[model samples]
Target chain A: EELFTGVVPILIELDGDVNGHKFFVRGEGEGDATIGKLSLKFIATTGKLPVPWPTLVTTLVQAFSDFFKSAMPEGYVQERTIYFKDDGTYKTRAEVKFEGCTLVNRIELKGIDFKEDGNILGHKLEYNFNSHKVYITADKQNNGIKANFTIRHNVEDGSVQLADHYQQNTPIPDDHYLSTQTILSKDLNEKRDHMVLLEYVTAA
Target chain B: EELFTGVVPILIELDGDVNGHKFFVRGEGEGDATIGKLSLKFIATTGKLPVPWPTLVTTLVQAFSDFFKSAMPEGYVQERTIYFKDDGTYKTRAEVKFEGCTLVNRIELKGIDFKEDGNILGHKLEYNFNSHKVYITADKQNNGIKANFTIRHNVEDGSVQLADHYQQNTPIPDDHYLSTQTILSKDLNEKRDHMVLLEYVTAA
Candidate 1:
C-alpha cells in the first residue's frame, strides 16, 4: 500500500527591492479538479505613494493572464476571477481544467511582472515546480511577455493538460477606498476536469 | 568536510507519567564535558493529582543520580546539580568531564523515572537513547508515583559533558525555602562531584 503524507507548507520570500507585498497561493479541489487561490497583500513601505490602486491591480491581472497563456498545457482552461477589497488587497481564484485525469503531475508559475506608470517596478523569470523534476519554459511574445502555463499530468503517458475558461473580472467595484476599510477582501475562482496523474520514483 | 543538519523544537511527550519535579545539572571544569538541562512542565491532563513540589524534586534528583552512575564513561569526573524555580518549575543540569577525546562515539539516556510522594510512579527504561525504543516499567521503589521530564544537551569527545560552573549558587538566606525544606537540597552540593561510569572500549 502506498502512503501519502499531507501537503506541507513552503514559504517563499520576495526581495525588498520589489513592492512591499506578500503573495500566497493555495492549491485545493476534489480529485483531479484542483484549483489555486492566489492572495496578495500590499504594505505601504515607501511612505504612501501617489500610485493608484487600479493600476497595481491591472498590472497583476495582466501578469497572471500572461503567465497562464505562456506556461500551462495547451487546451487547459483557466476558470478564474479576480477580487478586490476596500483596503487595497486582492485574491485570484482559478482552477486548471483537465479532461479524464485523476492526479496533477505538476503545476508551475513561469514568471511574474508588476509594472506601473510605464515603469517596470518588479519582474521575475523562472520556471520551477515542487512536483516536476525538470523545469518548463514559456513561449515569449510581446516583449517576452507571454503566460505559457503547462501542466503535465503524466510523464510516461505524456498526457499533458491545460486550463480552460481563462476569465478575469474585478469582484469589488473600482470606487472602493482604502481609508474606510480595516480588512481587505478578494477572491478568484476557476475549475478543470481530468485525471491528475503523478508518479513516485526512488533515487539511487 | 562534514555537513550536518539539526532538527530543533523537537517536541517529546512523556512515555508514562512523572509525579516528581525535574531539575538541571552541569559538569565541573573543562576538558571534554557534556552539559545537560532537564525541565518539567505540568500538563493538566485528565486523572492527575497535584503532587507536592519537594517530594517530586527529591525523587527526580535520586533517579538521575542512579542513571548517571550506570551510563558515564570510566575515569571521567561527572558533576550534577538541579534547580527549581519559585513558580513550581524545575531544571536539572548534568555534565561528564573527559580527559582528551574530541568526538562522541555514542550518546544515550540510560533510564527515566517519575515518582510521586516518595513512591515510584512509572519508569521508562531503555538501553538506547532513542526515546521511542523504550520499555515502560512501573515504578518499583518508594511507592507507585511518576514524573515527566525532558533531557537536552551538547556533547564532545567520546564522553558526555555538562555545563561548567554548576556550583555557583545564587545568593539566598540560609533559611531559604530550598535550603532547609527538603533532603534533596541537603545533598545538592555533594552531587556535583558524583560521576556515572559507563562501559566503553578505549582507543588504541
Candidate 2:
C-alpha cells in the first residue's frame, strides 16, 4: 500500500545576469502538503537593488512549483515500501530523490544542450555525481569546459558547494527593474536568451 | 546546509462510531507544499450516507494539517545529510519519519491513559514497532488489554496491518446529518467524546 510521508525538503539554485549585473538565489527548507519552511539566499555580484524579500521568496516559490508541475504524478505514490516479517513486525525501504535525480542507486546521464534558434551550438551537459565533476562542455561564448562547473556535494559532511562559475551574458531588454515581478515579465520572456537558469538538487 | 526535499507522502487512518454506525476512513498518497495527491477511502459499517467526497476529503485533510501543525519546525530542515570524499563524490544519509514517529532507528514508548474528567479510567498506551504487538491496557469499559490492538507493520514486504479492534462508544448528542460538514460543526465539537480518532502511519 502507498502512503504520503508528509515530509519534503526544498533545495534549489538560480543565477543569471541582468543589466550587466550578476545575481544568484538559493532556497533550502522542508515542507509537507499544506505548509512548510521557506529559506532563501539572494546574492548580488556587486551592487545592491530594491528587492522585497516577500516578493523574491514568493516568486521563486512559484517558479519551483512550475518546475515540478509537469513531473508531478497524480494520486498515490509508493516512495517507501514496508515488508512484513513473520514476527508481525515490519521493515521499510524508501527511494530518495533530489530535484529530479533519484538517489537510491547510481545515476549517469549525458545530453547536448541546444539553442532555441537551433542555429547556435549549445553546451554539452554531463551529470554523473559518481564522477564528482558535473561539468558542461561550453561553446565559443563560454570560456571553456573547465570554466563551467555546476555543483559538488560532499557525503561526509552533508555539505553542498555550488560552483557559481558560469555567467549568463543575456541582458534584460529595455529597463531592468531588479524586482522579481518585472524580471519574470513578458518583456524578458520574449527574449529567451535573457532568461534565468534555475536548478534543484537533494541529498540522501 | 539544510534543504527541503519537496516530496512528502500522505498516510493516515481514522475510525470512529458516529450515530449507530461504524466508519473508517483512510488516505494514502504523496504531495508537496501547494498540491500533490489526495487519495482516500471512506467506509461505513454496513450502511451508506450522504457524505460528499469533496467534503470528506477536505475535512480529513484539514485534520491531518492540524495534527502536524504544532510539531512542525521553523526554517530549513536537514532531513538528508551529504558528505564529501577526497574524490569529490558525496554520500548521503536521510532520516525518514511517518506521522510523528521517526524511522531511522528502533523506537519504544509507553504511556498511561486517563479520563479527561480525572475520574474514570482510560486505556494504557504502548507503542513499540520492534515488538509488533501493540496493545493497550484497557479499563472495565474495554474488554481487556488483549482486546485493544492498534497497528502492526511488516518490514519484510512493506505492509501495514491495523487491527481496528477498538470501539469508541461516544455518541453524537444531536441528530446526525451523515455529512462531513455537520459532523465537524460546533454541535459535535461540544462533546469531546464524540470526536473521531485519527491516526497516521507511513512505510519506508
Candidate 3:
C-alpha cells in the first residue's frame, strides 16, 4: 500500500535578541494513521541583524509560511471536520480549508475566557478535513504579536485514537506539539531561547 | 567564551535506492579550534537536485564552499590547500584562494582513478566571501551536472579525531581523510545518496 507523506509546521519559541533563533519542523503522517505519527524535527539558523525583534518575527513568520507552502504538492485538496466537545450538542467552532496546496484553518481565541496568567495570547488553530476551508475568529491580544493555535483534524470513525495521542500525552506526542521558550535577564537586555519538537511515525 | 560554529557536508546512503546519492550538512567545529570535534548526522531532503549522485556531490561542495565563504568574519583569512603524495614525494596538488568572501579552487578527476568501475570528471569552484561572489570551473562534465573532486584543509598542524566529548577528551586522534565510495544503487535512483568524510581529530 502506498503511504501518505505530509509536513506540518509547529511554532516553537523565538528568543535571544531575535538575532539567533532555533526552529524545528515535524514531518509526520505516513503509513497507518492509527499506529504511528509522522514526525521529524529539524533546526534552522538564520543570519543575525542589528535590529532584532521586528526582523526576528518577520523572518519567523515568513519561514513558517514558506515551509507550509512548499511542503505540499500543488493542487492537493484537503477536506475534513473537527469536533472537540463530545457533548450531544454539536458546537461548530471553526472551518478548515485545504485547497490549491494550502492548509488554511483558523480559530477564535477571544471567545475563550482565559486570564493573563495563561501566558497564551491568542486562539489555537483547528482543521476541518471535510470542508477544506479554515475559519478563524479574531482574538487579538498584545497587538497580534503573539498567539496560541491548535490543530484539529478529523479521522476515520476508529481513527479517533489518532487524535487521542495529543490529548493524553503529557509532554505531548512528539508528533503533535512544538514549543519555544525564552528567558530574559533582569536587565531585560540579555535573553535565552530554547525550542523543541515532538516526533511521530505511523505504522505500515 | 563564545563558540564558533562550522557546517560540513557528508554523504550518506539513502534508504531503498540505487546509486547512493544524498548530501547533508553536519554541524561541526563549534567555538575556537581549541574546542574539539562535534559530529552530528542528518539526512538532507532539500536544495538543488537531480537526486542521488548529482545532489550528493553538489551539496557537499556547496556546504564547504558556503561555510568557507559566509561563516568567517572580517580580519580573519581562511585558506585551504590540498597536498598529495606524488611518487613518494609530497607536493601541493592545489592551492585555493580565499579573498573578498570568495573561493577559487580547481580539482580534476577522470577515467575512474578512484573507483574501480566508473568514469570520473573534475570539479573546480571559486567564491568571494566578502562579496558573496561565487564562480565555478565551466568544464562541461562538471557544470552543475556530475563530477568528482576532493578538498583537504588545515594540512600543516591540522588533525582529525573521533572523541566522546567536544571539549574534554580527544580519545583517538589521527590524520583526517575522506573518500567517495561507489555510488550505491539506492542513491543513484534518488532514494538515497551517501558520501563518507574520513578524518581523525587529536586524541587528548
Candidate 4:
C-alpha cells in the first residue's frame, strides 16, 4: 500500500484588516503516527458559523470519552475532491498528488510566504523544476547561531521570492497562496471538522 | 464522500517543565475507513508521560472506543475559548475554532516542544505574513541524511526560528508565543475528565 498522501485545494484569500472573523490561534496536535506525510492546509470557505455545533460536539464527545474510556460511534468522513480546474493537461485533477510527493513536491516549496497565523516564516512545500524554484537553505542550531532563509518560486507567473541568508536580504514577504479552490460549503466533509478559524470565544 | 480536516484550540505554553502530561497518543486510527484521502493534523503535538487521571482516561476511552465500536455515550466536555486579542479590532475572546475537525473533542497535545521520543517533526499549519511566522523543516529518512530545519517568525517580535538545516543552525528556542491568551485556567473545557486518570486504577 502506498500508505497515504494526497491534498491540494487552496484558493484562500485574506490580505488585510481582517477583524472579528478571520481567525487563527489555539492549538493541539499529535504526531509521528508514522509520517506517511501529506500536505495542503489552505483553502477557506467551509462552514458552521465558525464554532458552535454544540460547541464542537461537546469537545469531541468529551475528548473521545475522557481520552478513551469507551462507548464509541460516529465514524464516517469522506470528501474526495480537493481542487480541480488546472485544465492545462497532465491531470491527476491538478497534479502534485503527494503520497509519492512527485519526487519532492515541486522541488521543496518553491517561493515562500504562507500565512493565516499558523505561520511558516519560511518553508512552503517544494517545487523546483529546473532551478526554476522552490527552495529553503540556511541553517545553524543546537545553540550555535547562524540564520539564513532562501526561497524561490516561479510557477510561470505568481512569482515568489525571499532571502535572508542570516539577515542581510531581510524584509520577509515572498508570499504564496495560489493553491486555489473555493467552495466555502456544500457542508464540506459534512463530518464537519472543516475548520478555518480566527479563534476566541466569549459572550456566548 | 469526505476525507477529513478539522482542528483548533491550543495556545498552550511551556518551553520548559512540561515533564509529560499533555495527552493525545494511545493510538487507534481507522485511517481511511474506506480511504478516500484527507488531511489536518498540524496543531503540533505528540505524546507520552506521567499523570494519573486514569492514564488520560485510558487513552481517551480507547481512541473513542476504537473509533466507534458501538454507539457512544458519556458525552460531556466543554472547553471553549481559543486565542483572541486583536483589540485593534474584535474579540470573540481570543478565538480560533476548529471543528468539523470532525467533531468530538477531547484531550490535548498543546503548546509544544513535545518530546520523550515521538517525532511529529513536520506538520506546521500556516502563517507567514511579513514573515511573522510558524514554519517547520528538517528532513532525511532512509538515511540519505539532510536535516536542516529553517524556521523563522518575527511576529512583531515573538520570533520563532527552527533551523536544523541538516544540522547547521539550531536552537530549541526561536520561542514563539505572543499569540498569547493565557487561560490555561478557568477550567474552560473543564470536563477535566476529573479523571484523576484511569478510573483510579479500579480504586487502587
Candidate 5:
C-alpha cells in the first residue's frame, strides 16, 4: 500500500568544469532515448566550500536525479524492499533504471554507496521528516543560507489543490533566511535565484 | 541589492466550484496576458481534511504563486522594505504583478491581507528557514504525513552544481515518510504522487 517507491538515476559526465557540470539522462538497452541536460551554479557568500567542489556537486545532483527518476515513475523499479527490523527500524530500498532514456557519456554510483553518510561527500549532514515538514541540508557551510515558505494541499470532491500560506500583518524579515525562494523554470529545472513574499490579503 | 521582489496576482475566478476554483492574473492598465492554468489533487489517508478545503488550498497556492512570480522575476516590485524594525524583525515585503502572462478569471486578496495570520486560514502554520533547509507545512491534519529527501547546490568556477544527498549504509525506513518525493514535470507542475529512495552509491 505504498504511494510510489523506486530508485531513479540520472548520469552526469564530469566533462570540463567550464559550464559547470553538464550531464543528461538517456534510455539504454533500446535505441538510447535522449532525456535531458542541465547546468547549475551555487556560490556561497564568501564563495568557498569546506569540501571538494566537483565531488560534492556530483554526489548531490546524482541523489536528486535518482529521486526524480523514481518519484516521477520515469523508470521501472530495479529493486525495492518494504520490511521491518528486529529492534524496530523500518528498512526500505529501491533501484530504478531509465525505461526509455539513456545517458551517452556518463558516470554512475558504485554499488549502494548512498547508504553510507561517510561516503556521501559533505559535512553537517542533516535531514528531517516531521509529520508536516520534510527537508535535507548537506554541505560544508563556508557561509550557509536558509529560507522559509509555506506549502499546502487540499482535497475537495475530486479536485486537489496546491498552494502557499503566509501571514498578512507582518512582512518577512530581511535578514532572515526566508528571503530566498525556489521556482521551476520553463524547462522545469529548479531555478534557485528568486525571493517571494505572500501576504494573507487580497488586492483591490 | 535584493534579488527579485514583487507582487504578481493570478486571480482564480470561483465560477461555480464545479472545476474546483479557477482563477487567473491579468494586466490592468495594459492588455492583460494569459499566464497558465493548473489542476491539483491531494488526498490524505482517510481522504478528508480537518479544515475547510477551498479556503486552505487557495491560501497555500497563492503563497506559492506569489513566490514564483517574484522568484522567477515574472512581476514588478510593488512595495519592498529592507530595513529593521524596533523588535528586531527583519521584516520584508514584496508585491509582484504578472508581467506578460495574465489570468482573466480572478479572485484577489483584499488590501494587504496577507500579513495577518489570524486571517490566513488553517491551523499549525509552521515555517522553517534553517541554514540549507527551507519548508512550510500548514493543515488541520486529520491524518498527517511527513516525507524526506535531499538537495545540494555546488559552485565550481562559473558552473553551479545541483543534486541530492543520501547514505549507502542503510536503506530508508519503510514506515518513514522519506519515501514521498517531489519532482517537476515538463509543464513544470508539482506532481506530488511520486515516491523515490536515493542511495549514495553509484552504478556502473
Candidate 6:
C-alpha cells in the first residue's frame, strides 16, 4: 500500500515477476499491490511523479529517454530549489530531482562519504510525512553556512500566490537573512507535454 | 542639497568644518541632487536601487545610528528581515539594526582586516549607484555569511516586510534557495509585545 498509497499503482518487476508487460493502477494511500495475493512492496526510489494517474497513462506519450531515463519521476525526487533575484524575478526556479513515487512516512537523502563508505554526510534531509515538513541539516559540514526554505504541494485555485515562510533552520536568526523570491510550481515546465498545471506557489 | 549628493552627513562630526546644528531635508529620487553641478561621481561596490524616495528616507533613519556605531540607513534607510511558518505564521517578524543618512553614490560595507588595516576582508557590499542592483559579496572571512533579498517600499500598502536572503560566505549556491517570506511594516510592535503582527512567509 505504501508503494501506491498517495499517488497510484506501479507494477514493478522485481524478480522477473510481471513478465515485462508492466503497467500501473490507481491505489489510494494504503496497502500492498496484490497480484494474485503476492502482495508486494514495490517502490520507485528514483522518479518524479508526473500526475495523479496510472503509470502507463502518465508515460503513454513519451520517448524512451523521457519515460525511462532523464524524465526524473517521484521515487527519484530531486531536491527542489528556488533563488529570488532583487525584483522577485527568479535566479533559480523552484526545482527538485524527479522522484516518481508515493508518500513515504519518512524520506531521507544523505550525502555519503566516499573516503569512508557507508558514512553519511552531515548534510541531509529527513522528511516526515506526518508533519508535511522536512527536518533538514547542513551541519556546517564544510563551511557551516546552511539555509532552509519552504515545501508544499499546491492544490488550491492555482492562481499566483506569494508567501514568505521561515527558513528550514526554522525561525532563522533575526540578523542573518535577506530577500524574497517566487518559487513557481514543481516541474513548472514542458518535458513531454501533458502537464500537471500546478501553481507558481511551491512544491518545495 | 548635500542630502542627495550620496553619503555622509552624519555629523559624524568629521573635522567639524561646518557650524554645529545640522540635519537634512528629505529628497525624492528623480530630478536634482545632480552629481555634475556637485555632479559628483558615486558608486557603491554592493547593491541596487528600484526606487528613490526611501533612499532619502532610510538615510534619514540611519545617520542617527552611524553617529553611534556601524548602523546603515536610507535617506533614512535600514535592513528589513522576516521569517514565517506554514499556514501564515512567524517567529521573527522583521528586524534590522537601524540606519539614517544621505546619498553617497558609491557606498560599500567592507569587513576590514584589523591587522592589515585598510586591507579589506573581502566580505563587502560594493554598491554602485549606476547599476540598479546590489553587488553583494561574502568572502569566507571569519565565517561571515551575508545574504541580500529582494526589497521595495510598498507604497500602495502601509505594511512592512523582510526576509533572510543570503547566508554568509552565504556563497548560497543557486540550488539551496527555496521560497520566500513576506515582511510587513517595520518593528510593528515594541519588541516585548509577543507579536504575530510581523510575517516571515518564509525565512529560507
Please provide, for model 3 over B4-58, each residue's C-alpha lDDT reduced to its tens digit, 9 standing for 90 to 100. Answer: 2222212222221112322233211111123223222223444422222322222
- Alpha carbon lDDT of residue A30, candidate 1? 21
Query: fnat, candidate 3?
Result: 0.00
Model 6 per-residue lDDT at A171? 10
Residue-level lDDT tens digits of model 2 in A141-183: 5321112323332222343322222322210112111111111
Model 6: per-residue Cα lDDT over B140-185, one tens digit each: 5533223454344332233323212232221001222222222222
lDDT of each residue in A1-204, candidate 6, tens digit only: 112111122232111101122222221121122211111132332233212221111111000101112222332222222222111211111111222222221222111112211111111112111113323334343322234553332323432222122222111011232222221122335342221211111112
The TM-score of predicted model 4 comes to: 0.18
Q: What TM-score, over all chains together, does every model reach?
A: 0.20, 0.24, 0.24, 0.18, 0.15, 0.16
Tens-digit lDDT track of model 5 for B98-132 = 32222222223221212222211222222211113
The clash numbers for all candidates, in the given order, read 77, 39, 76, 97, 74, 126
Residue-level lDDT tens digits of model 3 in A101-189: 22223221111222322111111211121111122222233111112233333332333211111111000001222322221112234
Instruction: Supply the TM-score for candidate 1.
Output: 0.20
**What is the C-alpha lDDT profile of model 2 across B117-200, one tens digit per residue?**
211111111212222332223233432111222333222234432322232111011111111111221124332222232233
How do the residues B17-83 of candidate 1 rate in per-residue lDDT, one tens digit apiece? 2334332222121111111222222222333323322222222211111221233333122222322
Worst 10 residues of 3 chain B by lDDT: B163-172
**Model 1 CA lDDT for position A169:** 23
Which 10-residue span in candidate 2 chain B carries the lowest summed lDDT? B170-179
Candidate 3 lDDT (Cα, 0 to 1): 0.22
Quote model 5's TM-score: 0.15
The weakest ten consecutive residues by lDDT in model 4 chain A span A58-67
Query: Which candidate gets the maximum DockQ versus the true structure?
Result: 2
Would you give me the overall lDDT of model 6?
A: 0.21
* Candidate number with the higher lDDT (2 or 3): 2
User: lDDT per prediction?
Assistant: 0.22, 0.25, 0.22, 0.20, 0.22, 0.21
Higher-TM-score candidate of 5 and 6: 6
Best by lDDT: 2
